[PDB]
Write a structure and sequence with these properties.
This protein is α+β, with helices and mostly antiparallel strands and 341 residues long. It folds into two domains: 2-73 and 255-316, D-Maltodextrin-Binding Protein, domain 2 (3-Layer(aba) Sandwich); 74-254 and 317-327, D-Maltodextrin-Binding Protein, domain 2 (3-Layer(aba) Sandwich). Helix content is 28%, strand content 19%. The protein has helices at 10-23, 36-45, 55-63, 123-137, 184-193, 204-209, 263-277, 316-320, 322-332, and strands spanning 4-9, 28-33, 50-53, 66-74, 92-99, 114-117, 148-150, 199-203, 228-231, 237-238, 249-251, 255-259, 304-308. Strands 5, 6, 7, 8, 9, 10 and 11 form a seven-stranded mixed β-sheet that branches. The protein has a four-stranded antiparallel β-sheet with strand order 3-12-4-13. α4 (123-137) links the parallel β6 and β7. The chain is globular. Bound molecules: a molecule of 4 linked components (NAG-NAG-MAN-MAN), a molecule of 3 linked components (NAG-NAG-MAN), a molecule of 2 linked components (NAG-NAG) (2 copies), fe (iii) ion and zinc ion (2 copies). A molecule of 2 linked components (NAG-NAG) binds at residues 2, 24-25, 27, 272. One zinc ion (ZN) is lined by residues 247, 250. Transferrins are iron binding transport proteins which can bind two Fe(3+) ions in association with the binding of an anion, usually bicarbonate. Hydrogencarbonate 2 binds at residues 118, 122, 124-125. Monomer. Found in a complex with LTF, CLU, EPPIN and SEMG1. Found in a complex with MPO and LTF; interacts directly with CP, allows Fe(3+) incorporation into LTF and activation of CP ferroxidase activity. This is Lactotransferrin. Disulfide bonds join 7-39, 17-30, 64-339, 84-306, 116-191, 140-334, 150-164, 161-174, 232-246, 284-289.
Length: 341
Protein backbone atom coordinates (compact mmCIF):
# COMPACT_ATOMS: atom_id res chain seq x y z
CA UNK A 1 0.00 0.00 0.00
CA UNK A 2 3.02 2.29 0.26
CA UNK A 3 2.67 2.84 -3.46
CA UNK A 4 3.19 5.99 -5.56
CA UNK A 5 1.28 6.54 -8.79
CA UNK A 6 3.50 8.37 -11.28
CA UNK A 7 1.89 10.25 -14.13
CA UNK A 8 3.40 9.69 -17.55
CA UNK A 9 2.81 12.14 -20.42
CA UNK A 10 2.32 10.42 -23.79
CA UNK A 11 2.96 6.78 -24.82
CA UNK A 12 6.75 6.92 -24.65
CA UNK A 13 6.87 8.15 -21.06
CA UNK A 14 4.26 5.48 -20.30
CA UNK A 15 6.54 2.74 -21.62
CA UNK A 16 9.45 3.91 -19.41
CA UNK A 17 7.15 4.32 -16.45
CA UNK A 18 5.90 0.71 -16.93
CA UNK A 19 9.52 -0.50 -17.00
CA UNK A 20 10.14 1.47 -13.82
CA UNK A 21 6.98 0.04 -12.28
CA UNK A 22 7.99 -3.53 -13.07
CA UNK A 23 11.51 -3.04 -11.74
CA UNK A 24 10.26 -1.38 -8.55
CA UNK A 25 8.15 -4.38 -7.56
CA UNK A 26 5.16 -2.13 -8.15
CA UNK A 27 6.22 0.26 -5.36
CA UNK A 28 5.71 2.81 -8.13
CA UNK A 29 2.76 2.49 -10.44
CA UNK A 30 1.79 4.34 -13.60
CA UNK A 31 -0.94 6.59 -14.84
CA UNK A 32 -0.89 8.20 -18.27
CA UNK A 33 -2.33 11.33 -19.83
CA UNK A 34 -1.87 13.08 -23.18
CA UNK A 35 -0.51 16.34 -21.81
CA UNK A 36 1.18 17.69 -18.75
CA UNK A 37 -1.94 19.71 -17.87
CA UNK A 38 -4.02 16.50 -17.96
CA UNK A 39 -1.50 14.85 -15.65
CA UNK A 40 -1.77 17.81 -13.22
CA UNK A 41 -5.53 17.25 -13.26
CA UNK A 42 -5.06 13.51 -12.43
CA UNK A 43 -2.88 14.45 -9.43
CA UNK A 44 -5.44 17.04 -8.31
CA UNK A 45 -8.20 14.46 -8.53
CA UNK A 46 -6.00 12.06 -6.58
CA UNK A 47 -5.91 9.57 -9.41
CA UNK A 48 -2.14 10.02 -9.71
CA UNK A 49 0.38 11.09 -7.03
CA UNK A 50 3.19 12.85 -8.80
CA UNK A 51 5.21 13.79 -11.83
CA UNK A 52 8.26 15.88 -12.60
CA UNK A 53 7.64 19.31 -14.07
CA UNK A 54 9.19 22.25 -15.79
CA UNK A 55 8.88 25.58 -13.91
CA UNK A 56 6.07 26.98 -16.07
CA UNK A 57 3.98 23.96 -15.19
CA UNK A 58 5.08 24.17 -11.55
CA UNK A 59 3.44 27.58 -11.62
CA UNK A 60 0.21 26.08 -13.10
CA UNK A 61 0.21 23.24 -10.55
CA UNK A 62 1.13 25.59 -7.71
CA UNK A 63 -1.91 27.79 -8.34
CA UNK A 64 -3.97 24.59 -8.08
CA UNK A 65 -2.42 23.73 -4.70
CA UNK A 66 0.23 21.26 -5.84
CA UNK A 67 3.67 21.61 -4.15
CA UNK A 68 7.37 21.09 -5.01
CA UNK A 69 8.75 17.88 -3.53
CA UNK A 70 12.26 17.25 -4.89
CA UNK A 71 14.24 18.98 -7.63
CA UNK A 72 16.34 17.64 -10.47
CA UNK A 73 20.02 18.20 -9.84
CA UNK A 74 22.37 18.30 -12.80
CA UNK A 75 26.03 17.58 -12.47
CA UNK A 76 27.85 20.61 -11.12
CA UNK A 77 31.21 20.63 -9.39
CA UNK A 78 30.33 23.50 -6.98
CA UNK A 79 29.42 22.67 -3.33
CA UNK A 80 32.15 20.01 -3.54
CA UNK A 81 31.88 17.19 -0.95
CA UNK A 82 28.20 17.54 -0.17
CA UNK A 83 26.30 14.70 -1.83
CA UNK A 84 23.97 15.45 -4.75
CA UNK A 85 20.79 14.70 -2.81
CA UNK A 86 21.62 17.51 -0.36
CA UNK A 87 23.32 20.00 -2.68
CA UNK A 88 21.28 23.14 -3.53
CA UNK A 89 20.16 23.48 -7.15
CA UNK A 90 21.68 26.18 -9.35
CA UNK A 91 19.13 26.38 -12.16
CA UNK A 92 19.59 26.12 -15.88
CA UNK A 93 20.35 28.66 -18.55
CA UNK A 94 17.59 29.59 -20.96
CA UNK A 95 19.09 30.46 -24.32
CA UNK A 96 18.19 31.35 -27.88
CA UNK A 97 20.14 29.36 -30.45
CA UNK A 98 20.61 29.90 -34.16
CA UNK A 99 22.82 28.51 -36.94
CA UNK A 100 26.17 30.24 -37.35
CA UNK A 101 25.52 30.29 -41.10
CA UNK A 102 22.33 32.28 -40.52
CA UNK A 103 24.55 35.36 -40.30
CA UNK A 104 23.01 38.63 -39.22
CA UNK A 105 20.25 37.05 -37.15
CA UNK A 106 20.21 38.63 -33.67
CA UNK A 107 17.83 39.18 -30.80
CA UNK A 108 16.86 42.42 -32.61
CA UNK A 109 15.94 40.80 -35.91
CA UNK A 110 13.74 37.91 -34.74
CA UNK A 111 10.44 39.43 -35.88
CA UNK A 112 8.90 37.53 -38.85
CA UNK A 113 11.47 34.74 -38.49
CA UNK A 114 10.68 31.05 -37.89
CA UNK A 115 10.80 29.74 -34.32
CA UNK A 116 11.18 26.44 -32.40
CA UNK A 117 9.80 26.16 -28.84
CA UNK A 118 9.88 23.24 -26.38
CA UNK A 119 6.13 23.74 -25.79
CA UNK A 120 3.73 26.51 -24.82
CA UNK A 121 3.90 27.40 -21.10
CA UNK A 122 7.38 25.96 -20.55
CA UNK A 123 10.21 28.07 -19.05
CA UNK A 124 13.00 28.31 -21.62
CA UNK A 125 10.93 27.43 -24.60
CA UNK A 126 8.13 29.87 -23.97
CA UNK A 127 7.73 31.90 -20.79
CA UNK A 128 11.17 33.57 -20.92
CA UNK A 129 11.21 34.26 -24.72
CA UNK A 130 7.60 35.32 -25.14
CA UNK A 131 7.79 37.33 -21.93
CA UNK A 132 10.76 39.27 -23.27
CA UNK A 133 9.12 39.72 -26.65
CA UNK A 134 5.79 40.93 -25.25
CA UNK A 135 7.79 43.26 -22.98
CA UNK A 136 9.64 44.72 -25.97
CA UNK A 137 6.90 44.90 -28.62
CA UNK A 138 4.56 46.35 -26.01
CA UNK A 139 1.90 44.05 -27.41
CA UNK A 140 0.09 40.82 -26.57
CA UNK A 141 0.10 39.62 -30.15
CA UNK A 142 2.96 37.18 -29.48
CA UNK A 143 0.99 34.93 -31.81
CA UNK A 144 1.78 37.26 -34.68
CA UNK A 145 5.45 37.88 -33.90
CA UNK A 146 7.20 34.94 -35.56
CA UNK A 147 6.05 34.15 -39.10
CA UNK A 148 5.77 30.41 -38.30
CA UNK A 149 6.66 28.29 -35.28
CA UNK A 150 6.47 24.87 -33.70
CA UNK A 151 5.02 25.60 -30.29
CA UNK A 152 3.57 22.29 -29.11
CA UNK A 153 0.40 22.94 -27.22
CA UNK A 154 -0.83 25.83 -29.37
CA UNK A 155 -3.69 25.74 -31.90
CA UNK A 156 -2.69 23.14 -34.55
CA UNK A 157 -4.20 25.19 -37.40
CA UNK A 158 -2.37 28.35 -36.32
CA UNK A 159 1.03 29.71 -37.33
CA UNK A 160 2.43 28.74 -33.94
CA UNK A 161 2.01 25.04 -34.99
CA UNK A 162 2.88 25.38 -38.65
CA UNK A 163 6.37 23.96 -38.30
CA UNK A 164 5.38 21.05 -36.04
CA UNK A 165 5.70 17.61 -37.65
CA UNK A 166 3.72 15.20 -35.48
CA UNK A 167 4.71 11.54 -35.32
CA UNK A 168 5.94 8.88 -37.74
CA UNK A 169 2.51 8.85 -39.33
CA UNK A 170 2.12 12.62 -39.22
CA UNK A 171 -0.58 12.34 -36.55
CA UNK A 172 -0.52 14.37 -33.36
CA UNK A 173 0.89 17.46 -35.06
CA UNK A 174 1.67 20.01 -32.33
CA UNK A 175 0.70 17.82 -29.34
CA UNK A 176 2.71 18.77 -26.27
CA UNK A 177 4.16 15.32 -25.66
CA UNK A 178 7.04 13.36 -27.06
CA UNK A 179 4.95 12.06 -29.97
CA UNK A 180 5.53 15.43 -31.63
CA UNK A 181 8.88 15.19 -33.42
CA UNK A 182 9.85 18.71 -32.39
CA UNK A 183 8.58 18.56 -28.76
CA UNK A 184 10.70 19.51 -25.75
CA UNK A 185 14.34 20.54 -25.49
CA UNK A 186 15.61 18.00 -27.98
CA UNK A 187 12.72 18.41 -30.42
CA UNK A 188 13.07 22.22 -30.50
CA UNK A 189 16.81 21.86 -31.02
CA UNK A 190 16.21 19.27 -33.78
CA UNK A 191 13.78 21.76 -35.29
CA UNK A 192 16.68 24.28 -35.54
CA UNK A 193 19.29 21.71 -36.58
CA UNK A 194 17.16 20.57 -39.52
CA UNK A 195 16.69 24.22 -40.47
CA UNK A 196 12.93 23.99 -40.05
CA UNK A 197 13.21 27.02 -37.80
CA UNK A 198 15.56 30.01 -37.55
CA UNK A 199 15.76 30.13 -33.74
CA UNK A 200 15.26 27.55 -31.01
CA UNK A 201 14.38 28.45 -27.43
CA UNK A 202 15.98 25.78 -25.25
CA UNK A 203 18.59 25.44 -22.49
CA UNK A 204 22.49 25.56 -22.56
CA UNK A 205 22.69 21.89 -21.85
CA UNK A 206 20.60 20.91 -24.88
CA UNK A 207 23.07 22.32 -27.36
CA UNK A 208 26.03 20.51 -25.76
CA UNK A 209 24.16 17.21 -25.32
CA UNK A 210 23.23 17.09 -28.95
CA UNK A 211 26.49 18.08 -30.66
CA UNK A 212 30.07 16.82 -31.20
CA UNK A 213 29.06 13.17 -31.01
CA UNK A 214 27.23 13.64 -27.71
CA UNK A 215 24.18 12.18 -29.46
CA UNK A 216 24.16 9.12 -31.73
CA UNK A 217 20.72 9.98 -33.12
CA UNK A 218 20.65 10.41 -36.91
CA UNK A 219 19.78 14.10 -37.09
CA UNK A 220 22.36 14.83 -34.40
CA UNK A 221 25.33 12.55 -35.23
CA UNK A 222 26.90 15.07 -37.52
CA UNK A 223 26.18 18.24 -35.60
CA UNK A 224 29.03 20.51 -34.49
CA UNK A 225 28.94 23.25 -31.81
CA UNK A 226 30.84 25.77 -33.89
CA UNK A 227 27.97 25.58 -36.35
CA UNK A 228 25.69 27.17 -33.75
CA UNK A 229 25.45 30.52 -31.93
CA UNK A 230 23.65 31.92 -28.87
CA UNK A 231 21.67 35.19 -29.20
CA UNK A 232 22.43 37.64 -26.39
CA UNK A 233 19.91 40.14 -25.14
CA UNK A 234 22.21 42.98 -26.27
CA UNK A 235 22.00 42.10 -29.96
CA UNK A 236 25.23 40.10 -30.11
CA UNK A 237 25.94 36.50 -31.11
CA UNK A 238 28.26 34.24 -29.18
CA UNK A 239 29.65 30.69 -29.33
CA UNK A 240 27.76 28.14 -27.30
CA UNK A 241 30.65 28.16 -24.80
CA UNK A 242 29.60 31.63 -23.68
CA UNK A 243 26.23 30.70 -22.20
CA UNK A 244 27.04 32.04 -18.73
CA UNK A 245 27.34 35.48 -20.37
CA UNK A 246 24.77 35.11 -23.15
CA UNK A 247 21.49 33.68 -21.86
CA UNK A 248 17.93 34.95 -21.62
CA UNK A 249 17.45 33.97 -18.00
CA UNK A 250 18.32 31.45 -15.33
CA UNK A 251 15.44 28.95 -14.87
CA UNK A 252 14.46 27.01 -11.73
CA UNK A 253 15.17 23.31 -12.17
CA UNK A 254 12.37 20.95 -13.16
CA UNK A 255 10.96 19.49 -9.96
CA UNK A 256 8.67 16.74 -8.73
CA UNK A 257 5.30 17.97 -7.54
CA UNK A 258 2.48 16.35 -5.67
CA UNK A 259 -0.59 17.08 -3.64
CA UNK A 260 0.39 18.57 -0.32
CA UNK A 261 -1.07 15.65 1.59
CA UNK A 262 1.00 13.08 -0.33
CA UNK A 263 4.24 15.10 -0.46
CA UNK A 264 6.00 13.35 2.39
CA UNK A 265 5.26 9.81 1.15
CA UNK A 266 6.22 10.71 -2.38
CA UNK A 267 9.55 12.14 -1.21
CA UNK A 268 10.27 8.98 0.83
CA UNK A 269 9.57 6.54 -2.02
CA UNK A 270 11.44 8.80 -4.46
CA UNK A 271 14.60 8.94 -2.38
CA UNK A 272 14.49 5.13 -2.09
CA UNK A 273 13.80 4.63 -5.81
CA UNK A 274 16.83 6.62 -6.95
CA UNK A 275 19.04 4.77 -4.47
CA UNK A 276 18.07 1.77 -6.66
CA UNK A 277 17.85 3.22 -10.16
CA UNK A 278 19.65 6.57 -10.01
CA UNK A 279 23.13 7.54 -11.28
CA UNK A 280 25.33 5.15 -9.25
CA UNK A 281 22.16 3.21 -8.45
CA UNK A 282 22.21 -0.37 -7.19
CA UNK A 283 20.31 -1.72 -10.18
CA UNK A 284 21.49 1.03 -12.43
CA UNK A 285 23.12 0.06 -15.60
CA UNK A 286 22.31 -3.53 -14.72
CA UNK A 287 18.51 -3.51 -14.50
CA UNK A 288 16.96 -0.07 -14.91
CA UNK A 289 18.09 3.53 -15.04
CA UNK A 290 15.56 6.19 -14.01
CA UNK A 291 17.54 9.01 -15.57
CA UNK A 292 18.19 7.47 -19.01
CA UNK A 293 16.00 7.27 -22.15
CA UNK A 294 18.31 7.95 -25.12
CA UNK A 295 18.37 11.78 -25.07
CA UNK A 296 14.59 11.72 -25.10
CA UNK A 297 14.30 13.10 -21.58
CA UNK A 298 11.45 10.79 -20.54
CA UNK A 299 9.98 11.39 -17.06
CA UNK A 300 13.21 13.14 -16.04
CA UNK A 301 15.86 15.01 -17.94
CA UNK A 302 18.62 12.61 -19.04
CA UNK A 303 21.31 14.84 -17.48
CA UNK A 304 19.82 14.51 -13.96
CA UNK A 305 22.36 13.17 -11.45
CA UNK A 306 19.77 12.92 -8.71
CA UNK A 307 16.58 14.31 -7.23
CA UNK A 308 17.58 16.64 -4.41
CA UNK A 309 15.87 17.71 -1.23
CA UNK A 310 14.56 21.26 -1.34
CA UNK A 311 15.72 24.26 0.68
CA UNK A 312 13.41 25.57 3.38
CA UNK A 313 10.26 23.57 2.53
CA UNK A 314 9.41 26.14 -0.14
CA UNK A 315 6.02 27.07 -1.43
CA UNK A 316 5.77 26.89 -5.17
CA UNK A 317 6.32 30.65 -5.32
CA UNK A 318 9.52 30.48 -3.30
CA UNK A 319 10.73 27.57 -5.42
CA UNK A 320 10.19 29.48 -8.64
CA UNK A 321 11.65 32.71 -7.21
CA UNK A 322 9.89 36.14 -7.22
CA UNK A 323 11.44 37.36 -10.47
CA UNK A 324 10.16 34.42 -12.52
CA UNK A 325 6.70 34.32 -10.86
CA UNK A 326 5.90 37.91 -11.76
CA UNK A 327 7.22 37.40 -15.26
CA UNK A 328 4.78 34.50 -15.75
CA UNK A 329 1.93 36.49 -14.23
CA UNK A 330 2.79 39.44 -16.48
CA UNK A 331 2.78 37.14 -19.51
CA UNK A 332 -0.46 35.33 -18.68
CA UNK A 333 -2.38 38.63 -18.73
CA UNK A 334 -2.20 38.31 -22.50
CA UNK A 335 -4.24 35.13 -23.03
CA UNK A 336 -3.31 35.84 -10.24
CA UNK A 337 -5.76 34.18 -7.83
CA UNK A 338 -6.34 31.27 -10.21
CA UNK A 339 -6.08 27.57 -11.13
CA UNK A 340 -7.46 27.45 -14.66
CA UNK A 341 -8.89 24.05 -13.75
C1 LIG B 1 26.52 23.86 -20.59
O1 LIG B 1 26.02 22.56 -20.44
C2 LIG B 1 27.06 21.61 -20.55
C3 LIG B 1 26.46 20.21 -20.46
O2 LIG B 1 25.45 20.17 -19.47
C4 LIG B 1 28.12 21.86 -19.47
O3 LIG B 1 29.28 21.14 -19.80
C5 LIG B 1 29.57 19.97 -18.97
O4 LIG B 1 30.37 20.44 -17.92
C6 LIG B 1 30.63 19.46 -16.93
C7 LIG B 1 31.32 20.14 -15.76
O5 LIG B 1 30.58 21.27 -15.34
C8 LIG B 1 31.46 18.32 -17.51
O6 LIG B 1 31.68 17.38 -16.47
C9 LIG B 1 32.74 16.40 -16.69
O7 LIG B 1 32.35 15.36 -17.56
C10 LIG B 1 33.31 14.37 -17.90
C11 LIG B 1 33.61 13.43 -16.73
O8 LIG B 1 32.44 12.73 -16.35
C12 LIG B 1 34.60 14.98 -18.48
O9 LIG B 1 34.81 14.60 -19.84
C13 LIG B 1 34.41 13.83 -20.97
O10 LIG B 1 35.01 12.94 -21.92
C14 LIG B 1 34.58 12.94 -23.28
C15 LIG B 1 35.20 14.10 -24.07
O11 LIG B 1 36.04 13.62 -25.11
C16 LIG B 1 33.04 12.87 -23.42
O12 LIG B 1 32.59 11.76 -24.21
C17 LIG B 1 32.29 12.91 -22.07
O13 LIG B 1 30.90 13.11 -22.28
C18 LIG B 1 32.88 13.97 -21.11
O14 LIG B 1 32.56 15.30 -21.50
C19 LIG B 1 34.67 16.51 -18.38
O15 LIG B 1 36.02 16.89 -18.52
C20 LIG B 1 34.07 17.08 -17.08
O16 LIG B 1 34.99 16.98 -16.01
C21 LIG B 1 30.71 17.73 -18.70
O17 LIG B 1 31.53 16.83 -19.41
C22 LIG B 1 30.25 18.81 -19.68
N1 LIG B 1 29.35 18.26 -20.68
C23 LIG B 1 29.70 18.04 -21.95
C24 LIG B 1 28.95 16.95 -22.66
O18 LIG B 1 30.56 18.68 -22.55
C25 LIG B 1 28.53 23.32 -19.35
O19 LIG B 1 29.23 23.50 -18.15
C26 LIG B 1 27.32 24.23 -19.35
N2 LIG B 1 27.69 25.62 -19.42
C27 LIG B 1 27.04 26.54 -18.71
C28 LIG B 1 27.29 27.98 -19.04
O20 LIG B 1 26.27 26.25 -17.79
C1 LIG C 1 7.95 42.22 -18.75
O1 LIG C 1 6.79 42.69 -18.08
C2 LIG C 1 6.98 43.47 -16.91
C3 LIG C 1 7.31 44.94 -17.20
O2 LIG C 1 8.41 45.05 -18.08
C4 LIG C 1 7.99 42.85 -15.95
O3 LIG C 1 7.41 42.87 -14.66
C5 LIG C 1 8.20 43.62 -13.71
O4 LIG C 1 9.40 42.95 -13.39
C6 LIG C 1 10.24 43.67 -12.51
C7 LIG C 1 11.61 42.99 -12.44
O5 LIG C 1 11.45 41.61 -12.20
C8 LIG C 1 9.61 43.78 -11.13
O6 LIG C 1 10.41 44.64 -10.34
C9 LIG C 1 10.70 45.12 -9.02
O7 LIG C 1 10.82 46.54 -9.00
C10 LIG C 1 11.43 47.15 -7.88
C11 LIG C 1 12.95 46.91 -7.85
O8 LIG C 1 13.56 47.48 -8.98
C12 LIG C 1 10.77 46.74 -6.55
O9 LIG C 1 10.16 47.84 -5.89
C13 LIG C 1 9.74 45.61 -6.69
O10 LIG C 1 9.55 45.04 -5.42
C14 LIG C 1 10.12 44.54 -7.72
O11 LIG C 1 11.03 43.61 -7.17
C15 LIG C 1 8.18 44.31 -11.21
O12 LIG C 1 7.49 43.89 -10.05
C16 LIG C 1 7.37 43.87 -12.44
N1 LIG C 1 6.32 44.85 -12.70
C17 LIG C 1 5.02 44.64 -12.49
C18 LIG C 1 4.41 45.21 -11.24
O13 LIG C 1 4.30 44.01 -13.27
C19 LIG C 1 8.31 41.41 -16.37
O14 LIG C 1 9.29 40.86 -15.50
C20 LIG C 1 8.82 41.36 -17.82
N2 LIG C 1 8.87 39.98 -18.29
C21 LIG C 1 9.99 39.26 -18.40
C22 LIG C 1 9.84 37.90 -18.99
O15 LIG C 1 11.10 39.65 -18.05
C1 LIG D 1 16.94 29.46 -1.08
C2 LIG D 1 17.60 30.67 -1.71
O1 LIG D 1 18.41 31.37 -1.10
N1 LIG D 1 17.26 30.91 -2.97
C3 LIG D 1 16.58 32.12 -3.35
C4 LIG D 1 15.37 31.74 -4.21
O2 LIG D 1 14.19 31.75 -3.41
C5 LIG D 1 15.14 32.61 -5.45
O3 LIG D 1 14.88 31.74 -6.55
C6 LIG D 1 16.09 31.36 -7.25
O4 LIG D 1 16.45 32.29 -8.25
C7 LIG D 1 17.70 32.02 -8.84
C8 LIG D 1 17.99 33.03 -9.95
O5 LIG D 1 17.29 34.22 -9.67
C9 LIG D 1 17.75 30.64 -9.47
O6 LIG D 1 19.12 30.36 -9.61
C10 LIG D 1 17.12 29.53 -8.62
O7 LIG D 1 16.79 28.48 -9.49
C11 LIG D 1 15.88 29.98 -7.86
N2 LIG D 1 15.63 29.06 -6.77
C12 LIG D 1 15.24 27.78 -6.86
C13 LIG D 1 15.64 26.92 -5.70
O8 LIG D 1 14.59 27.27 -7.78
C14 LIG D 1 16.22 33.66 -5.78
C15 LIG D 1 15.60 34.88 -6.46
O9 LIG D 1 14.76 35.54 -5.55
O10 LIG D 1 16.89 34.11 -4.63
C16 LIG D 1 17.58 33.03 -4.05
O11 LIG D 1 18.48 33.54 -3.13
C1 LIG E 1 9.19 -1.52 -1.92
O1 LIG E 1 9.33 -0.58 -0.89
C2 LIG E 1 9.43 -1.22 0.36
C3 LIG E 1 9.21 -0.20 1.48
O2 LIG E 1 9.77 1.05 1.13
C4 LIG E 1 10.76 -1.95 0.51
O3 LIG E 1 10.64 -2.84 1.60
C5 LIG E 1 11.78 -2.85 2.49
O4 LIG E 1 12.79 -1.92 2.18
C6 LIG E 1 13.72 -1.77 3.24
C7 LIG E 1 14.79 -0.77 2.80
O5 LIG E 1 15.23 -1.12 1.51
C8 LIG E 1 14.38 -3.09 3.62
O6 LIG E 1 15.00 -2.95 4.89
C9 LIG E 1 13.43 -4.28 3.67
O7 LIG E 1 14.18 -5.47 3.58
C10 LIG E 1 12.42 -4.23 2.53
N1 LIG E 1 11.42 -5.28 2.69
C11 LIG E 1 11.53 -6.47 2.10
C12 LIG E 1 11.23 -7.67 2.96
O8 LIG E 1 11.85 -6.61 0.92
C13 LIG E 1 11.09 -2.77 -0.73
O9 LIG E 1 12.50 -2.91 -0.83
C14 LIG E 1 10.54 -2.24 -2.06
N2 LIG E 1 10.37 -3.35 -2.98
C15 LIG E 1 11.06 -3.50 -4.10
C16 LIG E 1 10.85 -4.79 -4.84
O10 LIG E 1 11.85 -2.66 -4.53
FE1 LIG F 1 12.39 23.58 -18.58
ZN1 LIG G 1 21.98 35.99 -15.95
ZN1 LIG H 1 9.16 29.55 2.94
Amino acid sequence: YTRVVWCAVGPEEQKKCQQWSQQSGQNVTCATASTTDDCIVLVLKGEADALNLDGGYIYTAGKCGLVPVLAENRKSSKHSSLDCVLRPTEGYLAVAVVKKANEGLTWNSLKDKKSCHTAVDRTAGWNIPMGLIVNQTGSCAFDEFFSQSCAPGADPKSRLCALCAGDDQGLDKCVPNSKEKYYGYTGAFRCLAEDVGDVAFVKNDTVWENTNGESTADWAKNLKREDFRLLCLDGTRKPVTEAQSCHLAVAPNHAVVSRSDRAAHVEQVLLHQQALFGKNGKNCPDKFCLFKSETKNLLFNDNTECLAKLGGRPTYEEYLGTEYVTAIANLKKCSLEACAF
